[PDB]
Write a protein that binds this ligand. Sequence first.
Ligand SMILES: [Pr+3]
Ligand SMILES: [Pr+3]
Lengths: 155, 152
Amino acid sequence: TPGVEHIPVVQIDLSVPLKVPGLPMSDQYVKLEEAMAILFAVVARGTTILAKHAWCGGNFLEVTEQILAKIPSENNKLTYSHGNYLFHYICQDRIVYLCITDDDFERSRAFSFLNEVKKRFQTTYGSRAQTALPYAMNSEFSSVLAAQLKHHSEN
Amino acid sequence: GVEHIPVVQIDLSVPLKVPGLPMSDQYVKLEEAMAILFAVVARGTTILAKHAWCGGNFLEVTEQILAKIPSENNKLTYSHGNYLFHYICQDRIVYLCITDDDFERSRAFSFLNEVKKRFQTTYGSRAQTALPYAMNSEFSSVLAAQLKHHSE
Ligand SMILES: [Pr+3]
Ligand SMILES: [Pr+3]
C-alpha cells in the first residue's frame, strides 16, 4: 500500500463533535451499536405514582408497579438489575425517585439525574407530596422530567 | 461516584420490554492502528452510500464535514478530538472515512482508493446525478466488506 505524508493533516472545528459510545473510564473501548440512556423516570410515594415520563415505548408502569412494591419505606438509595436494564432509586422521607436505564448507562449519571429531579420536585411541591393523590403532579411535572431526562442522557 | 451504593438482582413476574432497541451490547478494544469506523461516498453535500462499523453520531458529523470540503480534486486528512477524517475528492465525488487519531493513514487511503475504483466501475456516470442515498441499499455492503478487510 502506497505513501501519504505529502497529504497534510488539517485541524478543524465542529459544532457537534463525534461521539462514539464506549466506557466511562478508558478510551480504547467502543460499543459496536448504540447505547441508550435513561428510558423512564417516576416520582412516587410508596406504591402511589405522582408523576412519570417515558422516552419511548415500554411496559413501564407494569414494571414500575412491581418495583415500588419491593422498595422499603426507610430512606436509602439502591440499584436493581434485571435483563439488560437497571433500575436506580432514591427513597427520601418516603418519596421515591426512580429511573430505568440501559445496562450501559453510567450509574453516577443516573443518580445525578435523580438528585436533580428530587431537588426540583421538593422545591416545586414541598410538603404536598406527602399527601397528594395519584398522578396529581403529572400534568405539570412530566415535562420537567422529560427535559431532565434529555439533558442527563446527553451530558 | 456511586460504588458504595449496591446493585441487587431482582426477579419480576412481568419483566421489562422495550421494543426498538438493539439486540445486544458488543464492546471491542479498539485496534487504534487498524480501525476504520465509518465510510461514506458523497457528491458535495449529498450522501450516496454509507456504512458504520460501530455506534456514533456519524451522519451528524458527516454533514458538518462535507460542508467544508472544496469541490476541486484533492486528498486530505482533518483532525478533530481523537479522530481523523480522510477523504479523496475526485470529479466532485468525495470518498471519506473516519478513524482514530493513531491509525495508519496509508491504510486509510488505500481503502479509499479501493472503494473509489469499485464505486466508479459499478456506478460510472450515474454518480454525477444520482439522488440522495440512491446507491446506499446496494453499496453499503461493499463498503462494509472493504471496511472489514482493511481493518484486518
Ligand atoms: Pr444494553
Ligand atoms: Pr488515540
